[PDB]
Amino acid sequence: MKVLVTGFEPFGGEKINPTERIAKDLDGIKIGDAQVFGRVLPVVFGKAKEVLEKTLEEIKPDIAIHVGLAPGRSAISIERIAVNAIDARIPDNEGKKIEDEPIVPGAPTAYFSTLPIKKIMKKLHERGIPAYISNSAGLYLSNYVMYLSLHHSATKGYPKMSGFIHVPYIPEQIIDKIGKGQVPPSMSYEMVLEAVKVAIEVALEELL
Amino acid sequence: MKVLVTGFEPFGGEKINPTERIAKDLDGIKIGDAQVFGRVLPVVFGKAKEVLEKTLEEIKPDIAIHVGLAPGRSAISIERIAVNAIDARIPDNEGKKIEDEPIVPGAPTAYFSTLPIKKIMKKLHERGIPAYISNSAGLYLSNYVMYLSLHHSATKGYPKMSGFIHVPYIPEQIIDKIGKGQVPPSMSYEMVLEAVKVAIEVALEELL
Amino acid sequence: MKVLVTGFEPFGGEKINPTERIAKDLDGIKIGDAQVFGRVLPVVFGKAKEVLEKTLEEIKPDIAIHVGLAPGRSAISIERIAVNAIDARIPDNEGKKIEDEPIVPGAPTAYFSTLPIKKIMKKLHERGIPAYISNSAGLYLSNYVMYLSLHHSATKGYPKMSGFIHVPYIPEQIIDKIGKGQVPPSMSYEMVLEAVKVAIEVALEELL
Amino acid sequence: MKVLVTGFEPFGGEKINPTERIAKDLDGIKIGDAQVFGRVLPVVFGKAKEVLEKTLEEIKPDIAIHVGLAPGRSAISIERIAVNAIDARIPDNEGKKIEDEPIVPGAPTAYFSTLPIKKIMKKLHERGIPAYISNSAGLYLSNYVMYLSLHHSATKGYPKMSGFIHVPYIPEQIIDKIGKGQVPPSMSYEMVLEAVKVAIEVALEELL
């Protein structure tokens, strides 16, 4: 069994992206007999697609769990659906602001995550990790990768399971925000990392 | 040197109050040559006052740091001011809902915290702990104890420093909220506990 | 040209639903040569579907604009997508709480609104009406009707345009909330009504 | 009987301040036999104090109701207390950012508003206007003027009643915010204006 976990590089002026650290921390670890691969994706349309496709083709993971930062969210959120659309509120790390455009022309308007989202949420709660199901992953890079991953699965037969998980800011990211007159919610890095590991474990169990 | 740290018992239907655990965890520990005393207060007007006064008279702390739970707040908050008023939105653990009434008739309308709040906030940020200064501790039990403590200091000469710190919900407290259709912010118990220890350390340093 | 505008009856303990008044106020009015039909739907799965289908078949509107109340939202929100799923956080007015179930088995996972959402948002802003595009209409009754309407259009060829618009609470609905210790955002009934009229006008212009 | 109502000029990059319009709209009107004076204050420490003092000395109002804009607040808020401190999160319209400094050295740490706040809130609710009591007017210009007004009353015997009322953004102010990726709450100008008139009426009735 092979598991692919992806994270994103910093974006929107943020100095760090905790999902980048998650991917690096999980890369190379084994959970039982399952091998985990951690890869960092660029927050750039086009390039992110190239890297994602190459990685999927290279590793051919049975399970793909894409992780991203959701500024302002107070708990772990498991995405229920990926939408075939791009409508960026801000430009990507290359200064491109795509608006009202499909991700894959002619493909389904949406794809449901194939991760066992309800079982994952339940296990997270048992571990004392606040989490809920999100019905919109946005229409920026997180949704972009989520959709392409699910499209790959529907078109190529793998990965068997694919989904997206958004995490809150970690505490250290809030420090300089306080001066800007506002304090968004945060969650410890340790908890965010464990949440992803739990998702992997539940997926492995639910897979076959 | 003696430090008094107080917490509160559960209230408002909540199953736990993380500040109760903070007080118990800090009780009896020593920070350098300073002795720390941890005491749990009831969330009941009158009784809370009795316990507080007895404890202050008994221990005669040089520093008093009162801690409480602030449901919904996203980071550690250090209270700048205590107000001479009681206007409860909900009744206390005895079913009493006091409205528009002074805490100490004839006493000052307000007292500024005497803890070195700015230095505490600065040290917390250096430790990677989100925190900000709050200008209202509410007009329920937290403010009640904060005011009585500062009044005691102004009238009896001790404690030399007195203040209040509110902490967010800890993660495990959010679990059953999710079902009630809403996800408030949270902070790890470990971080909330460390934040209080840091406040004690800064107060000890700033004291003399 | 015929325009169908729907609203919902009160639900979730609320005494009123401003969208019910919107539907009644717009029923029978004419905008140019276009005839507007206003109908109130029950907040009940199954029954809502029956009424919706009968109304669509009866009137055969060229444009269908479904309106609903979105407690907590601060501005007019135009829904971008309807999802083929039902996952109610609360039961409907008949005490039924449907969970993880498709609206139309075998039908597309999602449908994009066919109303000219960007042009509507732009006109609303020009009129001084705060509004934004929402990417999730929830998975309760609003999404239920939005999806069924768009499914009808894709399967029957009419209405040519279909979409959903969520409105905030109107001021009078906030009064008794204040006592429950919390103050959600609101928008005047006059503005909410005008927003819907504007949407109808833009749709008529964009249609042919 | 004479009533003084003040508002503020635009600040913080905002193009307008609805309270400036409130003051201008109420200036010169009569409510019964009571004469109302409306004056606009600068959002500048020092200068605001000069204008306020001159106005109070000039008019010698029986009632003083100071109004200000509270970005983000969802309903009318009546301030319960003014604090003897200045700790600005942003500089004033002159580029001055005062931090940790008293408004009037040696004066009381705080003053309670002398407006009949509970009766005002009650009448507002009866009129269908969402409103609540705020326990912190901030430590910027609004609090600055509120404190100086109450200090004037305690030191000079007039005005007999003094207080502060914060109002939400009005709808037109939200338009350009939507693009900045965020939609704060708003309230119609008509309602905000009526709320202030109601406060004046209740104060006049409660006065003698």
How far apart are the CA of C51 and the nearest CA of chain A, in angstroms? 27
Report yes or no: B77 and B165 within 8 Å, Cβ to Cβ.
yes
Any idea what DSSP says for residue C208? -
Strand partners for B167: B69
Strand partners for B6: B39, B66
Any idea what DSSP says for residue B42? -
Number of compact structural domains in chain B: 1
Strands (E), C51-181: 63-69, 76-79, 81-83, 110-112, 131-134, 161-167
* DSSP class per residue in A169-198: B-GGGTTTTGGGS----B--HHHHHHHHHH
CA C146 to chain centre: 7
Rg, Å, chain A Cα set: 16
**Cα-based angle B135, B139, B144 (whole degrees, multiple of 5):** 100
Strand partners for B33: none
Name residues whose C-beta falls within 8 Å of residue B177's C-beta, 6 or more positions apart in sequence. Answer: B183, B184
How far apart are the CA of A146 and the nearest CA of chain B, in angstroms? 24
Helix (H, G, I), strand (E, B) or coil at C92: coil
Give the residue among D17, D170, C170, A74 at the shortest CA–CA distance from B169: A74
Length of chain C: 208
Give the residue among A89, A193, A107 at the shortest CA–CA distance from A149: A107
Measured distance CA(C85)–CA(A133) in Å, rounded: 13
Strand partners for B8: B41
**Cα-based angle C119, C121, C122 (whole degrees, multiple of 5):** 65
Measured distance CA(A95)–CA(A47) in Å, rounded: 13
Angle between helices B47-59 and B141-156 (to 10 degrees): 40
Q: Give chain A positions within 8 Å (CB) of D138.
A: none
Measured distance CA(D39)–CA(D51) in Å, rounded: 9
Measured distance CA(D114)–CA(A9) in Å, rounded: 55
Interface size between B and D, measured as CB pairs under 8 A: 38
How far apart are the CA of C35 and the nearest CA of chain A, in angstroms? 31
**φ, ψ for residue D177 (rounded to 5)?**
-75, -40
Place of tokens 């109302």: D36
Burial degree of B98 (CB within 10 A; 0-12, 13-18, 19+): middle
Measured distance CA(D107)–CA(B43) in Å, rounded: 33
- Structure determination method: X-ray
Measured distance CA(B135)–CA(D82) in Å, rounded: 11
Strand partners for A30: A35
Neighbouring C-beta atoms of residue D108, cutoff 10 Å: 16
C-beta atoms of B183 and A129 within 8 A: no
Report yes or no: D97 and D88 within 8 Å, Cβ to Cβ.
yes
**φ, ψ for residue C79 (rounded to 5)?**
-75, 130
Give the residue among C7, C52, C3 at the shortest CA–CA distance from C29: C3
Among chain B, residues having any CB pair with chain C shorter than 8 Å are 89-90, 181
Any idea what DSSP says for residue D42? P
Report yes or no: D199 and D34 within 8 Å, Cβ to Cβ.
no
Measured distance CA(A113)–CA(A99) in Å, rounded: 24
Report yes or no: D88 and D140 within 8 Å, Cβ to Cβ.
yes
Report yes or no: B25 and B38 within 8 Å, Cβ to Cβ.
yes
Name residues whose C-beta falls within 8 Å of residue A25's C-beta, 6 or more positions apart in sequence. Answer: A38, A193
Strand partners for C39: C6
CATH of the domain at A6: 3.40.630.20
Q: Residue A74 half-sphere exposure, CB side, CA atoms within 13 Å?
A: 20
Give the residue among A149, A13, A85 at the shortest CA–CA distance from C133: A85
Helix (H, G, I), strand (E, B) or coil at C201: helix
* DSSP class per residue in D45-103: TTHHHHHHHHHHHHH--SEEEEEEE-TT--SEEEE-EEES-B--SS--TTS----SB-S
Instruction: Provide the token pair at C131.
Output: 């509004």
Measured distance CA(D31)–CA(D197) in Å, rounded: 9
Region label for D13, one of left (φ > 0), alpha (ψ between -120 and 50) or beta (otherwise): left
Report yes or no: B184 and B49 within 8 Å, Cβ to Cβ.
no
Q: Which amino acid is at A54?
A: K
Angle between helices C189-206 and C117-126 (to 10 degrees): 130
Helix (H, G, I), strand (E, B) or coil at C19: helix
Q: Which amino acid is at C21?
A: R
C-beta atoms of A185 and B129 within 8 A: no
Instruction: Provide the token pair at A68.
Output: 């991203």
Give the residue among C131, C198, C167 at the shortest CA–CA distance from C20: C167
Interface size between B and C, measured as CB pairs under 8 A: 4
Q: In angstroms, what is the resolution?
A: 2.0
* Residue range of the domain that includes B38: 1-208
Measured distance CA(D45)–CA(D92) in Å, rounded: 7
List alpha helices for D79-188, DSSP H: 117-126, 141-156
Angle between helices C47-59 and C141-156 (to 10 degrees): 40
Q: Give chain A positions within 8 Å (CB) of C109.
A: 81, 108-112
Neighbouring C-beta atoms of residue D88, cutoff 10 Å: 17
Measured distance CA(B124)–CA(B198) in Å, rounded: 7
Going from the C-alpha of C179 to that of each of C12, D130, D132, D155, the distances in angstroms are 18, 11, 9, 36
C-beta atoms of C186 and D184 within 8 A: no
Measured distance CA(C1)–CA(C146) in Å, rounded: 21
Instruction: Provide the token pair at D55.
Output: 């106005």
Helix (H, G, I), strand (E, B) or coil at A63: strand
**Site from B11, B87, B89 to mutate, C interface, most C CB atoms within 10 angstroms:** B89
Report yes or no: B120 and B80 within 8 Å, Cβ to Cβ.
no
Instruction: Provide the token pair at C5.
Output: 């505008």
**Cα-based angle A37, A41, A46 (whole degrees, multiple of 5):** 130
